[PDB]
Structure 1
């Protein structure tokens, strides 16, 4: 499905009730400095169950408009997402700040955060993995991440990590931690069994991503000389060690990784992001200024990949400072400030498809 629109009321700088969108398959959010683009990023995170600790505040009520100067405009606020699916009625997911607590709703019916997150998971929205959100200043670290942190991501998405606790317990029960592990019979077989379950869960995800990432890193760079390899440091027990990620930049010779430019790191990171999507597709990506280190050649290639993917596979919501990128979107959401006690954010919508992308 797709995110049809966001509705926001008194959330951070978004004073009053505002409709954000409707979104097209490729929509760019733009606006002058400090107008409130990030705050919109946070509103999406918020309605998707993100923790208050990650929303740039210290307590929930600070998300209410006017809190940072002691002028809260209401005792309540909300963000609501209208999720759409062909052949299906619209579904509305809302998170409301009431008192000092969050209330979760699906089609205006109260649900607990557990059911809320379970419902979003069934759509491909993983609140914990967060593989559909790339925050400002973070796209590069996705390709420079430590191998062991890459494994943690695969354990979360694959659910193999749900088996880790029992794995460790059985490993120690069969002799692990002794000077000479004597693994005999029943305890050894119980460990081999959980080992195999964890292996199977992990590889059902990792194999799919590893065998799809090369074509995507090609189709991203659109050159046959580019190559992408995902390999486990421990092939027998991949979940135990790191996942190595190496690339051959397009048209160039191999250079490690951490040696690459910010731009090449970006394309490699997006390659990994879209390869994860090929296994467990999310309905939409929200990408905050991922074009910051991209030159114009790579901007075109990333934008073209999105466009040739926004019809069928997924929807893309990007926040961009670079006209080279956002002029390739179908429509623009422009954020602007209104004068007041604190910053007030409002938005305009502009359809770019009315105009020839030519001369």
Structure 2
């Protein structure tokens, strides 16, 4: 389905109860320099299960509006997501701050964090892999990360990582760690967990690896572009790194680290979207991924999103660049209101009423 709207109450700078959205299939969040856009990113992360340690605060209660100046505005706060799916009633996922503790709710009924995470997983929202959300300044790292860290992401998404413990145990029992490892039974038991881990991992990796080239072609709009994912260890891919290499469109092969910030961004988005072909997320939240893109690549990314936002995924972007955000269907504009603490509020603007022409 799709993220229909966010409801926020007294969360960081979002004082009072505010409706964010409704979102269209392609919506941009914009506004002047301030804390409101980054706080909305944090609100989305919060309701989608982020740990307090990653929300720029020391304690959970510091997320309540007014805590930065020692005077919280309420004893409670929440962020709520309304999730919509054709042929089903709206489902509301909420995380409430009560008594300095987080309470999770689905359709206003309290659940434990485990069931909350489980229900989001069945919609394609993985709160550990977090492959649906890209933070400001982070998009290029998706293409540039250590290969071994890419393997970790594939082990989390594919659940092959759940087998790593039994794997390590059977490997040692087979003689790993001895000077000269030597048994038919232990060999078989290690070959069996090896195959199980291999099969889980490969179901994810082969899907992503076989779709990334077409996606990278579709983003840089060029047959000359090529993208390759390959394991350092083909017999046991989960043991070593997953290599990511691209041939920039119409350019000659350079080893990735020589690509421009813009080129790295496009390669990172291809990977992001290739992951989506294996375990699709209903929406992406992309924070300033256009920062290093020139106008040509901005056009190509927005075109890909637009043709994809017609019911493959929903795109919620935060952008500082009118070249990008004017290609969205609607705008959420964040603005400040004076107070003891700065207050953020929003406006909504429908761009589809105006011709994108002359």
TM-score, normalised to structure 2, is 1.00
Deviation at 1:188, TM superposition (A): 1.1
Deviation at 1:185, TM superposition (A): 1.2
Distance 2:221 2:154 in 1: 27
Distance 2:156 2:208 in 1: 14
Per-residue CA distance 1:25-56 (angstroms, 9 max, x = gap): 00000000014101000000000111000111
Distance 2:299 2:185 in 1: 59
Q: 3-state DSSP class of the match of 2:89?
A: strand
CA contact (8 A) 1:7 1:79 kept: yes
State the partner residue of 1:58. 58
Q: 3-state DSSP class of the match of 1:250?
A: coil
Distance 1:93 1:14 in 2: 18
Distance 2:337 2:343 in 1: 5
Distance 1:267 1:216 in 2: 10
Distance 1:6 1:339 in 2: 23
Distance 2:291 2:96 in 1: 33
| Greater shift in the superposed pair: 109-118 or 29-38 | 29-38
State the partner residue of 2:158. 158
CA contact (8 A) 1:331 1:353 kept: yes
CA contact (8 A) 1:35 1:335 kept: no
CA contact (8 A) 1:35 1:336 kept: no
Q: 3-state DSSP class of the match of 1:89?
A: coil
Q: CA RMSD in A?
A: 0.4
Distance 2:341 2:242 in 1: 46
Per-residue CA distance 1:272-315 (angstroms, 9 max, x = gap): 00000000000000000000000000000000000000012000
Unaligned regions of 5+ residues in structure 2, if any?
none
State the partner residue of 1:68. 68
Deviation at 1:217, TM superposition (A): 0.2
Q: 3-state DSSP class of the match of 2:124?
A: coil
Per-residue CA distance 1:78-123 (angstroms, 9 max, x = gap): 0000000000000000000000100000000000000000000000
Deviation at 1:187, TM superposition (A): 1.0
Distance 2:169 2:155 in 1: 18
Per-residue CA distance 1:113-169 (angstroms, 9 max, x = gap): 000000000000000000000000000011110000000000000000000011001
Distance 2:9 2:105 in 1: 15
Deviation at 1:343, TM superposition (A): 1.2
Distance 1:278 1:253 in 2: 28
Per-residue CA distance 1:217-252 (angstroms, 9 max, x = gap): 000001000000000000000000000000000010
Distance 2:306 2:177 in 1: 53
Distance 1:201 1:117 in 2: 21
Distance 1:273 1:286 in 2: 12
Distance 2:17 2:311 in 1: 32
Q: 3-state DSSP class of the match of 1:4?
A: strand
Q: 3-state DSSP class of the match of 2:39?
A: helix
Distance 2:172 2:17 in 1: 56
Distance 1:127 1:301 in 2: 29
State the partner residue of 1:210. 209
Tell whether 2:269 aligns with 1:283: no
TM-score, normalised to structure 1, is 0.99
How many residues of Structure 1 are paired with residues of Structure 2 in the alignment?
358
Distance 2:228 2:184 in 1: 39
